[PDB]
Each structure stands twice: as C-alpha cells, then as structure tokens.
mmCIF file of all heavy atoms in Angstrom:
data_model
loop_
_atom_site.group_PDB
_atom_site.id
_atom_site.type_symbol
_atom_site.label_atom_id
_atom_site.label_comp_id
_atom_site.label_asym_id
_atom_site.label_seq_id
_atom_site.Cartn_x
_atom_site.Cartn_y
_atom_site.Cartn_z
ATOM 1 N N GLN A 30 14.244 -24.738 -10.441
ATOM 2 C CA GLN A 30 14.494 -23.459 -11.066
ATOM 3 C C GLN A 30 13.305 -22.839 -11.544
ATOM 4 O O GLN A 30 13.151 -21.547 -11.434
ATOM 5 C CB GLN A 30 15.517 -23.677 -12.333
ATOM 6 C CG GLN A 30 16.977 -23.777 -11.773
ATOM 7 C CD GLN A 30 17.499 -25.119 -11.639
ATOM 8 O OE1 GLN A 30 16.987 -26.030 -12.344
ATOM 9 N NE2 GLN A 30 18.534 -25.323 -10.834
ATOM 10 N N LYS A 31 12.412 -23.469 -12.211
ATOM 11 C CA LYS A 31 11.160 -22.838 -12.702
ATOM 12 C C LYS A 31 10.354 -22.259 -11.588
ATOM 13 O O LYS A 31 9.772 -21.143 -11.744
ATOM 14 C CB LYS A 31 10.410 -23.928 -13.496
ATOM 15 C CG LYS A 31 9.180 -23.358 -14.173
ATOM 16 C CD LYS A 31 8.379 -24.398 -14.937
ATOM 17 C CE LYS A 31 9.120 -24.879 -16.210
ATOM 18 N NZ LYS A 31 9.309 -23.784 -17.182
ATOM 19 N N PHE A 32 10.190 -23.074 -10.402
ATOM 20 C CA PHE A 32 9.511 -22.603 -9.287
ATOM 21 C C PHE A 32 10.047 -21.263 -8.714
ATOM 22 O O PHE A 32 9.396 -20.263 -8.359
ATOM 23 C CB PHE A 32 9.326 -23.639 -8.246
ATOM 24 C CG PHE A 32 8.877 -23.161 -6.901
ATOM 25 C CD1 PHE A 32 7.562 -23.002 -6.643
ATOM 26 C CD2 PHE A 32 9.816 -22.824 -5.848
ATOM 27 C CE1 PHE A 32 7.182 -22.546 -5.378
ATOM 28 C CE2 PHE A 32 9.390 -22.313 -4.668
ATOM 29 C CZ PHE A 32 8.077 -22.240 -4.389
ATOM 30 N N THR A 33 11.428 -21.269 -8.564
ATOM 31 C CA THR A 33 12.068 -20.006 -8.060
ATOM 32 C C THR A 33 11.973 -18.852 -9.032
ATOM 33 O O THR A 33 12.130 -17.767 -8.595
ATOM 34 C CB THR A 33 13.499 -20.302 -7.730
ATOM 35 O OG1 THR A 33 14.239 -20.754 -8.924
ATOM 36 C CG2 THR A 33 13.650 -21.466 -6.617
ATOM 37 N N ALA A 34 11.859 -19.154 -10.293
ATOM 38 C CA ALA A 34 11.717 -18.106 -11.285
ATOM 39 C C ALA A 34 10.300 -17.449 -11.186
ATOM 40 O O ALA A 34 10.069 -16.342 -11.250
ATOM 41 C CB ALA A 34 11.981 -18.562 -12.710
ATOM 42 N N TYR A 35 9.305 -18.425 -11.019
ATOM 43 C CA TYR A 35 7.878 -17.970 -10.986
ATOM 44 C C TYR A 35 7.497 -17.436 -9.643
ATOM 45 O O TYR A 35 6.540 -16.740 -9.516
ATOM 46 C CB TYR A 35 6.949 -19.220 -11.316
ATOM 47 C CG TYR A 35 6.767 -19.525 -12.763
ATOM 48 C CD1 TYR A 35 7.486 -18.825 -13.804
ATOM 49 C CD2 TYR A 35 5.905 -20.561 -13.199
ATOM 50 C CE1 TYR A 35 7.242 -19.130 -15.072
ATOM 51 C CE2 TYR A 35 5.742 -20.869 -14.547
ATOM 52 C CZ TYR A 35 6.414 -20.113 -15.484
ATOM 53 O OH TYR A 35 6.298 -20.418 -16.824
ATOM 54 N N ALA A 36 8.326 -17.690 -8.599
ATOM 55 C CA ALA A 36 8.016 -17.155 -7.294
ATOM 56 C C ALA A 36 7.871 -15.649 -7.356
ATOM 57 O O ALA A 36 7.043 -15.087 -6.563
ATOM 58 C CB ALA A 36 9.165 -17.576 -6.306
ATOM 59 N N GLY A 37 8.720 -14.924 -8.076
ATOM 60 C CA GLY A 37 8.584 -13.537 -8.247
ATOM 61 C C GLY A 37 9.371 -12.778 -7.204
ATOM 62 O O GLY A 37 9.356 -11.476 -7.313
ATOM 63 N N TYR A 38 10.165 -13.314 -6.346
ATOM 64 C CA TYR A 38 10.909 -12.601 -5.377
ATOM 65 C C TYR A 38 12.130 -11.970 -6.049
ATOM 66 O O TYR A 38 12.587 -10.918 -5.552
ATOM 67 C CB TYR A 38 11.230 -13.482 -4.206
ATOM 68 C CG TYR A 38 12.190 -14.628 -4.550
ATOM 69 C CD1 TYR A 38 13.546 -14.404 -4.557
ATOM 70 C CD2 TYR A 38 11.787 -15.869 -4.857
ATOM 71 C CE1 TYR A 38 14.427 -15.309 -4.803
ATOM 72 C CE2 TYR A 38 12.615 -16.824 -5.116
ATOM 73 C CZ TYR A 38 13.926 -16.670 -5.171
ATOM 74 O OH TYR A 38 14.797 -17.652 -5.383
ATOM 75 N N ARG A 39 12.665 -12.630 -7.013
ATOM 76 C CA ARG A 39 13.905 -12.179 -7.678
ATOM 77 C C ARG A 39 13.668 -10.764 -8.362
ATOM 78 O O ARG A 39 14.691 -9.924 -8.400
ATOM 79 C CB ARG A 39 14.519 -13.166 -8.607
ATOM 80 C CG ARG A 39 15.083 -14.363 -7.886
ATOM 81 C CD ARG A 39 16.005 -15.130 -8.763
ATOM 82 N NE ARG A 39 15.477 -16.237 -9.543
ATOM 83 C CZ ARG A 39 15.785 -17.475 -9.425
ATOM 84 N NH1 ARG A 39 16.610 -17.899 -8.583
ATOM 85 N NH2 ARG A 39 15.046 -18.399 -10.163
ATOM 86 N N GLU A 40 12.545 -10.539 -8.982
ATOM 87 C CA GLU A 40 12.223 -9.233 -9.660
ATOM 88 C C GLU A 40 12.192 -8.139 -8.618
ATOM 89 O O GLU A 40 12.313 -7.002 -9.048
ATOM 90 C CB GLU A 40 11.000 -9.348 -10.443
ATOM 91 C CG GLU A 40 11.008 -10.285 -11.542
ATOM 92 C CD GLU A 40 10.794 -11.786 -11.230
ATOM 93 O OE1 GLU A 40 10.517 -12.026 -10.038
ATOM 94 O OE2 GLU A 40 10.871 -12.614 -12.135
ATOM 95 N N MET A 41 12.118 -8.417 -7.400
ATOM 96 C CA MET A 41 12.165 -7.356 -6.357
ATOM 97 C C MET A 41 13.397 -7.138 -5.648
ATOM 98 O O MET A 41 13.525 -6.510 -4.645
ATOM 99 C CB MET A 41 11.007 -7.714 -5.240
ATOM 100 C CG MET A 41 9.646 -7.616 -5.826
ATOM 101 S SD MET A 41 8.382 -8.065 -4.628
ATOM 102 C CE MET A 41 8.540 -6.647 -3.559
ATOM 103 N N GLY A 42 14.488 -7.687 -6.204
ATOM 104 C CA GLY A 42 15.819 -7.480 -5.734
ATOM 105 C C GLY A 42 16.228 -8.512 -4.578
ATOM 106 O O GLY A 42 17.418 -8.454 -4.084
ATOM 107 N N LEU A 43 15.261 -9.299 -4.101
ATOM 108 C CA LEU A 43 15.565 -10.159 -3.045
ATOM 109 C C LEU A 43 16.180 -11.457 -3.403
ATOM 110 O O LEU A 43 15.810 -12.071 -4.341
ATOM 111 C CB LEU A 43 14.235 -10.573 -2.274
ATOM 112 C CG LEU A 43 13.537 -9.417 -1.598
ATOM 113 C CD1 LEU A 43 12.043 -9.720 -1.377
ATOM 114 C CD2 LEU A 43 14.177 -9.028 -0.364
ATOM 115 N N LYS A 44 17.297 -11.812 -2.751
ATOM 116 C CA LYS A 44 17.783 -13.230 -2.827
ATOM 117 C C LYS A 44 16.911 -14.178 -2.021
ATOM 118 O O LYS A 44 16.136 -13.671 -1.196
ATOM 119 C CB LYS A 44 19.265 -13.287 -2.354
ATOM 120 C CG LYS A 44 20.197 -12.423 -3.239
ATOM 121 C CD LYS A 44 21.652 -12.494 -2.620
ATOM 122 C CE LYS A 44 22.510 -11.600 -3.399
ATOM 123 N NZ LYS A 44 22.825 -12.141 -4.805
ATOM 124 N N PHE A 45 17.057 -15.445 -2.273
ATOM 125 C CA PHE A 45 16.204 -16.366 -1.527
ATOM 126 C C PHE A 45 16.345 -16.239 -0.018
ATOM 127 O O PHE A 45 15.373 -16.037 0.733
ATOM 128 C CB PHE A 45 16.551 -17.790 -1.865
ATOM 129 C CG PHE A 45 15.937 -18.809 -1.045
ATOM 130 C CD1 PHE A 45 14.596 -19.069 -0.964
ATOM 131 C CD2 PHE A 45 16.740 -19.583 -0.085
ATOM 132 C CE1 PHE A 45 14.003 -19.960 -0.206
ATOM 133 C CE2 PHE A 45 16.141 -20.506 0.756
ATOM 134 C CZ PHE A 45 14.785 -20.739 0.735
ATOM 135 N N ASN A 46 17.609 -16.169 0.429
ATOM 136 C CA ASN A 46 17.820 -16.050 1.963
ATOM 137 C C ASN A 46 17.278 -14.791 2.602
ATOM 138 O O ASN A 46 17.116 -14.710 3.767
ATOM 139 C CB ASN A 46 19.229 -16.190 2.303
ATOM 140 C CG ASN A 46 19.716 -17.620 2.224
ATOM 141 O OD1 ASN A 46 18.935 -18.553 2.645
ATOM 142 N ND2 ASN A 46 20.888 -17.936 1.642
ATOM 143 N N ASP A 47 16.932 -13.733 1.786
ATOM 144 C CA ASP A 47 16.172 -12.653 2.366
ATOM 145 C C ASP A 47 14.708 -13.017 2.825
ATOM 146 O O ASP A 47 14.323 -12.365 3.762
ATOM 147 C CB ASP A 47 16.235 -11.484 1.351
ATOM 148 C CG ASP A 47 17.534 -11.179 0.776
ATOM 149 O OD1 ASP A 47 18.482 -11.278 1.566
ATOM 150 O OD2 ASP A 47 17.695 -10.869 -0.377
ATOM 151 N N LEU A 48 14.123 -13.906 2.160
ATOM 152 C CA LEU A 48 12.741 -14.238 2.472
ATOM 153 C C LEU A 48 12.704 -14.973 3.778
ATOM 154 O O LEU A 48 11.556 -15.059 4.448
ATOM 155 C CB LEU A 48 12.084 -15.087 1.424
ATOM 156 C CG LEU A 48 12.264 -14.478 -0.023
ATOM 157 C CD1 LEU A 48 11.436 -15.284 -1.013
ATOM 158 C CD2 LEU A 48 11.768 -13.013 -0.041
ATOM 159 N N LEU A 49 13.774 -15.638 4.286
ATOM 160 C CA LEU A 49 13.624 -16.475 5.430
ATOM 161 C C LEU A 49 13.071 -15.803 6.569
ATOM 162 O O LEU A 49 13.319 -14.548 6.830
ATOM 163 C CB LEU A 49 14.962 -17.011 5.807
ATOM 164 C CG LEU A 49 15.807 -17.815 4.647
ATOM 165 C CD1 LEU A 49 17.085 -18.315 5.152
ATOM 166 C CD2 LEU A 49 14.880 -18.978 4.083
ATOM 167 N N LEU A 50 12.208 -16.522 7.371
ATOM 168 C CA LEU A 50 11.598 -15.952 8.596
ATOM 169 C C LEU A 50 12.587 -15.640 9.604
ATOM 170 O O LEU A 50 13.266 -16.493 10.222
ATOM 171 C CB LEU A 50 10.592 -17.062 9.073
ATOM 172 C CG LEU A 50 10.012 -16.800 10.504
ATOM 173 C CD1 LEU A 50 8.985 -15.642 10.464
ATOM 174 C CD2 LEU A 50 9.317 -18.112 10.934
ATOM 175 N N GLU A 51 12.775 -14.285 9.818
ATOM 176 C CA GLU A 51 13.809 -13.719 10.682
ATOM 177 C C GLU A 51 13.525 -13.946 12.108
ATOM 178 O O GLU A 51 14.359 -14.191 13.010
ATOM 179 C CB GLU A 51 14.154 -12.296 10.381
ATOM 180 C CG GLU A 51 15.237 -11.599 11.329
ATOM 181 C CD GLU A 51 15.155 -10.206 11.239
ATOM 182 O OE1 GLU A 51 15.607 -9.589 10.296
ATOM 183 O OE2 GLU A 51 14.643 -9.532 12.275
ATOM 184 N N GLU A 52 12.208 -13.997 12.436
ATOM 185 C CA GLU A 52 11.858 -13.913 13.827
ATOM 186 C C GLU A 52 11.848 -15.297 14.549
ATOM 187 O O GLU A 52 10.952 -15.898 14.848
ATOM 188 C CB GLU A 52 10.435 -13.347 13.956
ATOM 189 C CG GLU A 52 10.291 -11.840 13.971
ATOM 190 C CD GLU A 52 10.400 -11.127 12.652
ATOM 191 O OE1 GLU A 52 9.925 -11.883 11.613
ATOM 192 O OE2 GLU A 52 10.726 -10.099 12.485
ATOM 193 N N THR A 53 13.147 -15.747 14.656
ATOM 194 C CA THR A 53 13.468 -16.968 15.415
ATOM 195 C C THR A 53 14.752 -16.850 16.088
ATOM 196 O O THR A 53 15.627 -16.262 15.422
ATOM 197 C CB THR A 53 13.332 -18.293 14.535
ATOM 198 O OG1 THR A 53 14.386 -18.195 13.467
ATOM 199 C CG2 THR A 53 11.906 -18.381 13.922
ATOM 200 N N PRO A 54 14.976 -17.428 17.250
ATOM 201 C CA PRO A 54 16.293 -17.283 17.919
ATOM 202 C C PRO A 54 17.449 -17.824 17.026
ATOM 203 O O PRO A 54 18.490 -17.175 16.941
ATOM 204 C CB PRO A 54 16.179 -17.998 19.186
ATOM 205 C CG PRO A 54 15.052 -19.025 18.924
ATOM 206 C CD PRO A 54 14.119 -18.272 18.074
ATOM 207 N N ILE A 55 17.256 -18.965 16.363
ATOM 208 C CA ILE A 55 18.340 -19.512 15.524
ATOM 209 C C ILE A 55 18.579 -18.599 14.288
ATOM 210 O O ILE A 55 19.707 -18.216 14.067
ATOM 211 C CB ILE A 55 17.948 -20.950 14.940
ATOM 212 C CG1 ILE A 55 17.461 -21.794 16.230
ATOM 213 C CG2 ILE A 55 19.052 -21.597 14.291
ATOM 214 C CD1 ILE A 55 18.491 -21.934 17.257
ATOM 215 N N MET A 56 17.464 -18.156 13.740
ATOM 216 C CA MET A 56 17.669 -17.271 12.516
ATOM 217 C C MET A 56 18.262 -15.911 12.948
ATOM 218 O O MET A 56 19.107 -15.361 12.305
ATOM 219 C CB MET A 56 16.343 -17.012 11.812
ATOM 220 C CG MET A 56 16.481 -16.244 10.554
ATOM 221 S SD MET A 56 17.442 -17.030 9.308
ATOM 222 C CE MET A 56 16.266 -18.297 8.852
ATOM 223 N N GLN A 57 17.849 -15.410 14.156
ATOM 224 C CA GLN A 57 18.306 -14.086 14.578
ATOM 225 C C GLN A 57 19.864 -14.283 14.928
ATOM 226 O O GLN A 57 20.508 -13.268 14.638
ATOM 227 C CB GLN A 57 17.566 -13.821 15.885
ATOM 228 C CG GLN A 57 17.946 -12.367 16.400
ATOM 229 C CD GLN A 57 17.591 -11.268 15.336
ATOM 230 O OE1 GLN A 57 18.480 -10.735 14.707
ATOM 231 N NE2 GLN A 57 16.433 -10.945 15.236
#
C-alpha cells in the first residue's frame, strides 16, 4: 500500500490497470 501510494499515479486519476503496457496482443 505504501508503494502504491508513493507511486504517484493515483494523484493523476489513473487506476493501476491503466498503467499496464497496452502494446501486447494479450493486453490488446
């Protein structure tokens, strides 16, 4: 929890799964 809080992505409106690398056939 501390690492995900310090990551700083939440303050920009992003959920974790938004960060995932989209450019892959499985992810796509």
Side-chain angles (χ1 to χ4, degrees):
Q30 277 98 26
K31 186 180 289 293
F32 165 85
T33 61
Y35 281 3
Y38 66 85
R39 288 201 268 241
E40 292 82 3
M41 293 177 70
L43 296 160
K44 297 178 186 291
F45 171 69
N46 281 321
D47 307 324
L48 307 188
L49 301 181
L50 170 67
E51 178 197 283
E52 274 86 26
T53 60
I55 309 301
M56 185 64 72
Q57 184 62 255

